[PDB]
Amino acid sequence: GSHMATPWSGYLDDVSAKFDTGVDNLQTQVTEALDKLAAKPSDPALLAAYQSKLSEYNLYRNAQSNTAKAFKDIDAAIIQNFR
């Protein structure tokens, strides 16, 4: 068959890679950033690190949610319009 490339999929694996692995990665990264922040005393980088992942994560929930929609939609044209 093929590698990650099926019709009417989008969430079958595409979006899921940016949603599950993507967001799950952003959710576990701050966890590391957590054990890492408490690792070093009051530090600029460690704290900035968990936050850097935070601001990107909180926005992630909205972005990935607004990007996945148009993503699965474009495929709808590759079958009816062949795009």
From Swiss-Prot:
Further remark: The levels of PrgI/SctF are reduced in an invA/sctV mutant, probably due to protein instability, and are increased in an invJ/sctP mutant.
Q: What is this protein called?
A: SPI-1 type 3 secretion system needle filament protein
Activity control note? Binding of bile salts, including deoxycholate, to the PrgI:SipD interface may inhibit the T3SS function.
Q: What is the effect of changing residue 83 to K?
A: Exhibits constitutive secretion of substrates. Can invade cultured epithelial cells
Per the record, the GO terms for biological process are: protein secretion by the type III secretion system
Induction behaviour: Negatively regulated by PhoP-PhoQ.
Q: What effect is documented for mutating residue 29 to E? A: Has wild-type invasiveness
What Gene3D superfamilies does the entry give?
A: 1.20.58.90
| Stated family | Belongs to the SctF family.
The record gives the effect of mutating residue 34 to A as: Exhibits constitutive secretion of substrates. Does not display SipD/SctA at the tip of the needle filament. Is non-invasive. Can polymerize into filaments in vitro
